């Protein structure tokens, strides 16, 4: 789980990928028990 670099044409594309980079990276800081609680509800809504 090292650091990967990527580039992107156009400002709007960048600001979207940043917003996602953010939530995806910040995922690691969400307590597992609440993650497990989320996933157990996703099953039942699909």
């Amino acid at each position: 789980e090292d650091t990967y670099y990527l580039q992107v044409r156009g400002r709007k594309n960048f600001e979207i990928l940043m917003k996602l980079k953010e939530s995806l990276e910040l995922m690691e800081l969400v307590p597992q028990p609440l993650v497990d609680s989320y996933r157990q509800q996703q099953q039942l809504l699909q």
Partner: protein, 125 residues
Amino acid sequence: SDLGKKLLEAAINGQLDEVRILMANGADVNAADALGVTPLHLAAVWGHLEIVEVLLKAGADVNAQDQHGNTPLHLAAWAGHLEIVEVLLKHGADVNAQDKFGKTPFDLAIDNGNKDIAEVLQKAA
């Protein structure tokens, strides 16, 4: 203005004064989000001792369960918040409560290296 959501947001964010004023305007201390997570859960996992105490004093269910059967005791144990664990036990937290994978608060403590907390839970038997 729905005071359920506002109180959950405040618990997470350690806003003691905010929590106190929301309760005085009638907020439900047993308010739960889509996942059954309560302000007591959120204050417990993010290490907000004072907020844990005001909620318990205000009649917050100590053994409330989310989708996963996480109790406040589970989340405190998970998160390595010894002072908060001690208070929950005082207010009658089920040591033996099981999440849906059959983990106890004791087990979550061990799994995350919270040995001090595990010793407390073992003897609180």
